[PDB]
Design a protein around this ligand. Sequence first.
Ligand SMILES: O=c1cc[nH]c(=O)[nH]1
Ligand SMILES: O=c1cc[nH]c(=O)[nH]1
Lengths: 272, 272
Amino acid sequence: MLTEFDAGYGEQPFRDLCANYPGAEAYDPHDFRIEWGPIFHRGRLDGSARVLIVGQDPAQHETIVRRILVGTAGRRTQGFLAKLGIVQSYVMVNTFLYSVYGQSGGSKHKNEPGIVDYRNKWFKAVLGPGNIEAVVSLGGLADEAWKAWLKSSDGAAYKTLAYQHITHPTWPESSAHDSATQAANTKIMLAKWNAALAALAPEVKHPDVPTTLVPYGDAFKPSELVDIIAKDLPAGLPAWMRGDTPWAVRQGVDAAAKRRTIMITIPDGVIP
Amino acid sequence: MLTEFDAGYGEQPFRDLCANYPGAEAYDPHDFRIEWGPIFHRGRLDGSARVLIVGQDPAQHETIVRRILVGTAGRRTQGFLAKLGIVQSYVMVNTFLYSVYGQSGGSKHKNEPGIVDYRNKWFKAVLGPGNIEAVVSLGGLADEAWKAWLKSSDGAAYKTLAYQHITHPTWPESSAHDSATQAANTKIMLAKWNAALAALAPEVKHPDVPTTLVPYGDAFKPSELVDIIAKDLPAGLPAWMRGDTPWAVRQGVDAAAKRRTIMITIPDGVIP
Ligand SMILES: O=c1cc[nH]c(=O)[nH]1
Ligand SMILES: O=c1cc[nH]c(=O)[nH]1
């Protein structure tokens, strides 16, 4: 009928934010992939947001879509929020603007003023209206990011919020090699996720659709992997860039080659 | 004082346009690369527009920047407009939303009833404010596109509008293989261009900068290759995305793979 899209960052305070973002003076160019520029958010900036997701750092798919959480992690997160009856009314700022280069990480820089101060201005901007009913952090650094926000002047008012530390969507796969232990560490992730949902269900009193909580099983049921909605992607992008199939990856013979190149690859079935 | 960027298409009437665009029902999926989405424009949509550029079709350098004419062609067009003394005050629009898949030139469909009307839907919108001081078409289908606009109801008001059809900026390289023949067709494009500049310059009464008209020589002065300005690119996009060096190309072993894939590689010098 009509196809929805995220107009982007026209309205203040987001215009100045996207107009005045930090570079090498804050993010170390070797430890952070600043070469790809910053990806700022995913979701609503009009106030209709009820849940805030605090993620960790972008990847190759985010680098093309220019929105965060549009890969596997985001697709698992979508379903997580889908269980809360939340289908679009969300906001998702990543901790770090740029991706960590290695597991060396931003954790070497998690308390750097350049990173924290800027991130907090975004926190303040999305929470200002005060329509956020819950907060869900993805992983450890997201947690300390949310905590570091709360110990600040502007953050103190949000200590009563419904924050919830969550394990990082892809811990299973980055923690493990065999697929047995990965599934084993998937079962433990879903368990902790269920705990968080049980904790958050009562506090989200404005869902997009009223839905009674259906807990995760031992593994990811496909119904619980929801494609990113069109309203999240900028004008024109194709629906294969928000689908169930991977379409972006870094390529190179050595670590240097991989850092400079990305390959976009359209899934089979789009072209006749 | 910092970097700029294109908010996107959030103010009407452009958002509804970007929300209701034509797809396979208008652009033939075999002849057009509908697979990458439509790219809508480049430049100003706030009324500051002075020149309308009607280009032909997007390329790889337009599938990423999401803006049209951001490669060699755009950089030549950029240099062209600099001579009219306008450095930002422009609007750029293509004949086709999607790129042509082949050498034919997507002419077989140059008269569709879904392709043409939409292009005109944009024309009416960009001309609506009535501050457009000049029109420049790039190549044959660009030329025929402007004429097709003029033969319509809403277009009738613009037959008096200063218009110059010029050779498509990449005519030299798409014609021949030898450096010499490309070198031979060097002033044949400029000289023909100089006339259009001579013809429009007096009618471009509101430039961004008072500028002395300098006709083209026989070849492209490096100064006549102007990098695309930041305000044209969406928020966050790295400045290597709009530099003097190419950074995107199609790759594959057969024709099918090549249509599905795109390699982006960052130029040397971005990463220390
Ligand atoms: O943006 C992203 C992408 C993957 N994982 C995250 O935590 N954030
Ligand atoms: O946008 C573009 C890019 C290349 N050539 C064109 O005609 N238009």
